[PDB]
Design a binder for this molecule. Structure first.
Ligand SMILES: C[C@@H]1C[C@@H]([C@H](O)CC2CC(=O)NC(=O)C2)C(=O)[C@@H](C)C1
Ligand SMILES: [K+]
Ligand SMILES: [K+]
Ligand SMILES: [K+]
Ligand SMILES: [K+]
Ligand SMILES: [K+]
Ligand SMILES: [K+]
Ligand SMILES: [K+]
Ligand SMILES: [K+]
Ligand SMILES: [K+]
Ligand SMILES: [K+]
Ligand SMILES: [K+]
Ligand SMILES: [K+]
Ligand SMILES: [K+]
Ligand SMILES: [K+]
Ligand SMILES: [K+]
Ligand SMILES: [K+]
Ligand SMILES: [K+]
Ligand SMILES: [K+]
Ligand SMILES: [K+]
Ligand SMILES: [K+]
Ligand SMILES: [K+]
Ligand SMILES: [K+]
Ligand SMILES: [K+]
Ligand SMILES: [K+]
Ligand SMILES: [K+]
Ligand SMILES: [K+]
Ligand SMILES: [K+]
Ligand SMILES: [K+]
Ligand SMILES: [K+]
Ligand SMILES: [K+]
Ligand SMILES: [K+]
Ligand SMILES: [K+]
Ligand SMILES: [K+]
Ligand SMILES: [K+]
Ligand SMILES: [Mg+2]
Ligand SMILES: [Mg+2]
Ligand SMILES: [Mg+2]
Ligand SMILES: [Mg+2]
Ligand SMILES: [Mg+2]
Ligand SMILES: [Mg+2]
Ligand SMILES: [Mg+2]
Ligand SMILES: [Mg+2]
Ligand SMILES: [Mg+2]
Ligand SMILES: [Mg+2]
Ligand SMILES: [Mg+2]
Ligand SMILES: [Mg+2]
Ligand SMILES: [Mg+2]
Ligand SMILES: [Mg+2]
Ligand SMILES: [Mg+2]
Ligand SMILES: [Mg+2]
Ligand SMILES: [Mg+2]
Ligand SMILES: [Mg+2]
Ligand SMILES: [Mg+2]
Ligand SMILES: [Mg+2]
Ligand SMILES: [Mg+2]
Ligand SMILES: [Mg+2]
Ligand SMILES: [Mg+2]
Ligand SMILES: [Mg+2]
Ligand SMILES: [Mg+2]
Ligand SMILES: [Mg+2]
Ligand SMILES: [Mg+2]
Ligand SMILES: [Mg+2]
Ligand SMILES: [Mg+2]
Ligand SMILES: [Mg+2]
Ligand SMILES: [Mg+2]
Ligand SMILES: [Mg+2]
Ligand SMILES: [Mg+2]
Ligand SMILES: [Mg+2]
Ligand SMILES: [Mg+2]
Ligand SMILES: [Mg+2]
Ligand SMILES: [Mg+2]
Ligand SMILES: [Mg+2]
Ligand SMILES: [Mg+2]
Ligand SMILES: [Mg+2]
Ligand SMILES: [Mg+2]
Ligand SMILES: [Mg+2]
Ligand SMILES: [Mg+2]
Ligand SMILES: [Mg+2]
Ligand SMILES: [Mg+2]
Ligand SMILES: [Mg+2]
Ligand SMILES: [Mg+2]
Ligand SMILES: [Mg+2]
Ligand SMILES: [Mg+2]
Ligand SMILES: [Mg+2]
Ligand SMILES: [Mg+2]
Ligand SMILES: [Mg+2]
Ligand SMILES: [Mg+2]
Ligand SMILES: [Mg+2]
Ligand SMILES: [Mg+2]
Ligand SMILES: [Mg+2]
Ligand SMILES: [Mg+2]
Ligand SMILES: [Mg+2]
Ligand SMILES: [Mg+2]
Ligand SMILES: [Mg+2]
Ligand SMILES: [Mg+2]
Ligand SMILES: [Mg+2]
Ligand SMILES: [Mg+2]
Ligand SMILES: [Mg+2]
Ligand SMILES: [Mg+2]
Ligand SMILES: [Mg+2]
Ligand SMILES: [Mg+2]
Ligand SMILES: [Mg+2]
Ligand SMILES: [Mg+2]
Ligand SMILES: [Mg+2]
Ligand SMILES: [Mg+2]
Ligand SMILES: [Mg+2]
Ligand SMILES: [Mg+2]
Ligand SMILES: [Mg+2]
Ligand SMILES: [Mg+2]
Ligand SMILES: [Zn+2]
Lengths: 105, 49, 54
RNA sequence: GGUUAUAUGCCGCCCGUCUUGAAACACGGACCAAGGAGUCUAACGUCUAUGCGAGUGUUUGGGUGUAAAACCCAUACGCGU
RNA sequence: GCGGUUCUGACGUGCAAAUCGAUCGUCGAAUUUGGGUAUAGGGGCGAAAGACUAAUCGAACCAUCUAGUAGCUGGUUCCUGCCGAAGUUUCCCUCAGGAUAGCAGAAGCUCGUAUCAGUUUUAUGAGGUAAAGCGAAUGAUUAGAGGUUCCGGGGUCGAAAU
RNA sequence: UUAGUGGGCCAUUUUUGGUAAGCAGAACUGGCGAUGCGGGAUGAACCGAACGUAGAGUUAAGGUGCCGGAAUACACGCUCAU
RNA sequence: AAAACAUAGCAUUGCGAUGGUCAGAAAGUGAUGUUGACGCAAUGUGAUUUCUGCCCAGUGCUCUGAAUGUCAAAGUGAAGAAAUUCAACCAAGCGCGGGUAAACGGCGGGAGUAACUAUGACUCUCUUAAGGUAGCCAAAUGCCUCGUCAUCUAAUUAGUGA
RNA sequence: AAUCAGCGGGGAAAGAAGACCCUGUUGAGCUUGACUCUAGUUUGACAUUGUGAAGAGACAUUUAUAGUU
RNA sequence: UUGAAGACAUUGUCAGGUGGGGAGUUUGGCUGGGGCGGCACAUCUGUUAAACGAUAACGCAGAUGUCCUAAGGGGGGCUCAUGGAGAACAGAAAUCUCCAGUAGAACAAAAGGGUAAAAGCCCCCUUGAUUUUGAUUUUCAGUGUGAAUACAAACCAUGAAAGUGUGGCCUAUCGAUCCUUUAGUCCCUCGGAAUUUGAGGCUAGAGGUGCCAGAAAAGUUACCACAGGGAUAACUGGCUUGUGGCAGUCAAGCGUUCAUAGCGACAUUGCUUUUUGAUUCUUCGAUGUCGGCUCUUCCUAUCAUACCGAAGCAGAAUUCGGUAAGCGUUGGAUUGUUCACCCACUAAUAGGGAACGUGAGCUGGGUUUAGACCGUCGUGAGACAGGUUAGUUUUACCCUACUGA
């Protein structure tokens, strides 16, 4: 799937509340902090004897992730997120489809 | 012997079943066979330096 | 071992013991799912009729 | 007329159990006595009775006593408002 | 003396929780054996059978934790009266089990001939099963008949010929 | 508000798999399970009919040679099987 | 009670004591050891005779082998008010590379080709390391199978030889 | 009626809550390239821990800088 | 005291590696037993399905874990499959033209439905595939998830406009709690008081659980254990009779000639329970599990013997058939065998049943516990309806039956 690098869509920002132009990127998770309370608790639980104290997932099934778009408004800089359906190939501002061309050998 | 008694024990034929060469870093109960062997098999030649 | 999978045998007999009750009707049903634009006005209309029979 | 034993006519498989289905060629039971299995507690739901009622609950404790009883009680605290 | 092959003998509620008879292996050593002594339970000891470790061994015995847990088996003690089921729904490492809804009892409460009803009638909808159809669409299928190839092919003239 | 239950099974009709099955699986109803009683010799489910204790009458389904309560009844035919 | 175990014989492995193998909760602690390679420890095979093929890709074991892959804690540097963050450095091990089958083990398939046909010494091929050598065989190892031939018998799923 | 010696057809005779098989969210003996650990062992760091040298390398193609490993 | 050794080593603490030697644990489910296989486990289309809805089976034929900035949204113009007749090279098939053409095309992907100045084809403009939360339909407990429907309040797109548009013409295309992470408010909290970092909250997403309402998980046991199961396999028995076995009917042919002496194709009706399946009703607090030996009795579908009919019956030998189960039906080699096979005798060497008769009647060769060897398989423990060798066969004195007393 191919989606354009810009998109005019609604902006929730209090100085907009109207359709504005947005830059479109893909969302990437973010580095897990060592001081997030869950990480600190896990570290305490894992210390000492007793081995692995929490489940470890093994039974992977999916071969895709949902794509999320980060839309940044070009006026106010407010951001929004949009989830696409599952897909195997994703590109952002790819070359558009030409109709009615000879498929080369 | 039976498995309870020796690493080599057991089996529906008598056989070792894993390499008989054992690491120098193996622990008591594992060091049976040829410990830390540089080579094995019939020595074709003279052993003198 | 294998067992029975499904049947509705005996289910209508069970249903008819405490009968199949028709759902019971009121003057004044809920205005629930009625168009909000209509409802919003209708409040204002009913307000005025009170302030008039007074 | 009752009771009881017997006779006669007709009828009447061995109980208990699990089970769709037991008289079963399913299981327990030779016999008899005595023992032998839904209890108490903490905290709760519905319902009912009783007291008092925007309150209610004396019993931690104190007072008293014919002494583990009965009788009396301040401040809190609990639940409710 | 030590052993324990065969009879698959006796016996098999025994003489005996391993015996008896005959037959048999070995009989100067890797021999047999008394006493002393060492090795102790995930331990010992093993010319190795998971053998032996006090009639206990693929982990002894004793006490305790311990009335260990059991979706599994068995049992569960007086009388009469009235009402009276389910084996189905959904979810569950669910399929010999639960939760859930249903069916059932009890307690009633608000009223008092309604609102009702495993029923008919009248009116008015919906339905694509039974039947039917295939000289109607799709698909299958028997037979001739007529017609046509600016072309399919066998027969034979035919320069070649729509 | 709370119990039990959450193995079902059979018959008629509709019905799938299967050569078929007292086989496996569905549909609607009635049953058995939970239920005795009269009948079908016998039998969970068929037919009749559902049950307080008694008396009398009448019947259901099934019967009336004898066993066995009830016509070796009446009537028209058919049938003789080493 | 045996064809199993042991056995002599054979072969391999480790170790020169600051040691190998093994013990202990620990120890100014132990076994081997009153020992010292013709020894102690760990394995395999199983008298003599005769022989003991090929494969180091895998798993293992092993190496004064390359290094700049991976790479802990402490330490170091930078940023920051600091908690901290980031980086560089970075032991052994892993990875990379060599050795080793009396280490665990492995030892396939197709096509063509000789002057009767047949067969294929010979040749070409595919294949994950290599492609079963010497021998031996319907063997206590062969499904098909009571294999085929011979012998043994009147007759043999038996026996023996092939 | 009451019975004696025999006998092994039957009592699906007796002996043991089937060892086979399945089920149980019941085990245990054993194995491994299962999950999770662990004695031991090995490697580094700090401590035990004091006192001296000398070279050879690294840090802001050769070759000079000052400090620090 | 004397040698060695020396700030190394040793010892202590922490860190990385190694570590079935050892410890603990796990090693789904459904299922015509279980296992192997499959997925009927989350789903979608058509049919089964009995014309409302619901509806099973490891029923039938198929599909899903995607794909798309257009293949989404709006508007415009146009018309498809196919066939016919024409046009240099050009032919069955190239491109152009006319006529016919109810969809026989296309619409991402299964199948069904839907669609013609369109929902198809081409072109133009776009981001309604957006924001805020509620209601509703399906599945249903009337929970969740998914999917979908109609509005509201905004902001937009398109179009002259009415309108249409909250992703894909409709019916599938997917995911809790905890944790992490992002967006939003730049808001609440850090509880002696402040500021700034950090952490924690509130609202909306993503990271995934396919066993799809969502454990973190490998084997073996013939050394085996326990709770149970006839809810479930391995005998008999029962239902069934495909398969096996036996018998009919028809008569095209065969039989020198001649359908039927004897046979008999294509068809087709049955019987039997001496085959083997199918099933799972009985038995898992146990009905002793192959074969032989012994012994009795029964069936007849008759091998022999008696008496007969028929013949392609001259005789002799034989063949087909009837009444017949009265009477017999064997000795051996090999194999545990059942079965088979051969030698031989014979009047004849028929077939079967009785819990696949018969183990408190035997035996124990086979099978089928524990020992052991081999081969193949397996890294291994171990497996083998493969071969091989060794492996405790218990009790009657009761009742009946029977034999005698
Ligand atoms: C696989 C990863 C983790 C997983 C999840 O946090 C696992 C948890 C779930 C839970 O409630 N308790 C636990 O202890 C484990 C999740 O959400 C995924 C998207 C991302
Ligand atoms: K072994
Ligand atoms: K089941
Ligand atoms: K079922
Ligand atoms: K009397
Ligand atoms: K029972
Ligand atoms: K029994
Ligand atoms: K141990
Ligand atoms: K003892
Ligand atoms: K123990
Ligand atoms: K259960
Ligand atoms: K019609
Ligand atoms: K038609
Ligand atoms: K209930
Ligand atoms: K329930
Ligand atoms: K009844
Ligand atoms: K009856
Ligand atoms: K009646
Ligand atoms: K009689
Ligand atoms: K060896
Ligand atoms: K190799
Ligand atoms: K190697
Ligand atoms: K054990
Ligand atoms: K030191
Ligand atoms: K360690
Ligand atoms: K280990
Ligand atoms: K099966
Ligand atoms: K829903
Ligand atoms: K599940
Ligand atoms: K296990
Ligand atoms: K048949
Ligand atoms: K059975
Ligand atoms: K049984
Ligand atoms: K004879
Ligand atoms: K023996
Ligand atoms: Mg800590
Ligand atoms: Mg730790
Ligand atoms: Mg072991
Ligand atoms: Mg063995
Ligand atoms: Mg090993
Ligand atoms: Mg059920
Ligand atoms: Mg099902
Ligand atoms: Mg009298
Ligand atoms: Mg009677
Ligand atoms: Mg039963
Ligand atoms: Mg009973
Ligand atoms: Mg019976
Ligand atoms: Mg029982
Ligand atoms: Mg008894
Ligand atoms: Mg008793
Ligand atoms: Mg008593
Ligand atoms: Mg003796
Ligand atoms: Mg004996
Ligand atoms: Mg005796
Ligand atoms: Mg053994
Ligand atoms: Mg108890
Ligand atoms: Mg107990
Ligand atoms: Mg009643
Ligand atoms: Mg679950
Ligand atoms: Mg039960
Ligand atoms: Mg139709
Ligand atoms: Mg239909
Ligand atoms: Mg029809
Ligand atoms: Mg309950
Ligand atoms: Mg259930
Ligand atoms: Mg149940
Ligand atoms: Mg059944
Ligand atoms: Mg019942
Ligand atoms: Mg009758
Ligand atoms: Mg009479
Ligand atoms: Mg012996
Ligand atoms: Mg030996
Ligand atoms: Mg030798
Ligand atoms: Mg570090
Ligand atoms: Mg290194
Ligand atoms: Mg092997
Ligand atoms: Mg050869
Ligand atoms: Mg051979
Ligand atoms: Mg052989
Ligand atoms: Mg031979
Ligand atoms: Mg012989
Ligand atoms: Mg032979
Ligand atoms: Mg008897
Ligand atoms: Mg006797
Ligand atoms: Mg049992
Ligand atoms: Mg077993
Ligand atoms: Mg379960
Ligand atoms: Mg265990
Ligand atoms: Mg283990
Ligand atoms: Mg299962
Ligand atoms: Mg479901
Ligand atoms: Mg319908
Ligand atoms: Mg479209
Ligand atoms: Mg709902
Ligand atoms: Mg869905
Ligand atoms: Mg504070
Ligand atoms: Mg689920
Ligand atoms: Mg059964
Ligand atoms: Mg019994
Ligand atoms: Mg018995
Ligand atoms: Mg018996
Ligand atoms: Mg006859
Ligand atoms: Mg039979
Ligand atoms: Mg028998
Ligand atoms: Mg016996
Ligand atoms: Mg027998
Ligand atoms: Mg017997
Ligand atoms: Mg035997
Ligand atoms: Mg054995
Ligand atoms: Mg006597
Ligand atoms: Zn903005």
């Amino acid at each position: 799937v191919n989606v354009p690098k810009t998109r005019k869509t609604y902006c929730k920002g209090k100085t907009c509340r109207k359709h504005t132009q947005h830059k479109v990127t893909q969302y990437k998770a973010g580095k897990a902090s060592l001081f997030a309370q869950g990480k600190r608790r896990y570290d305490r639980k894992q210390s000492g004897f007793g081995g692995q104290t929490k489940p470890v997932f093994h039974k992977k099934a999916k071969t895709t992730k949902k794509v999320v778009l980060r839309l940044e408004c070009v006026k106010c800089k407010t951001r929004a997120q949009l989830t696409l359906k599952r897909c195997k190939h994703f590109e952002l501002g790819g070359e558009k489809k030409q109709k009615g061309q000879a498929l080369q050998f | 012997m039976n498995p309870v008694d020796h690493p080599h024990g057991g089996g529906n034929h008598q056989h070792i079943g894993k390499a008989s060469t054992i690491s120098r870093g193996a622990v008591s109960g594992q060091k049976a066979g040829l410990i830390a062997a540089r080579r094995t098999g019939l020595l074709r030649g003279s052993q003198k330096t | 071992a294998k067992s029975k999978n499904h049947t509705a045998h005996n289910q209508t007999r069970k249903a008819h013991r405490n009968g199949i009750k028709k759902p019971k009707t009121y003057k004044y049903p809920s205005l629930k799912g009625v168009d909000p634009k209509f409802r919003r006005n209708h409040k204002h209309a009913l307000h005025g009729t009170a302030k008039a029979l007074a």
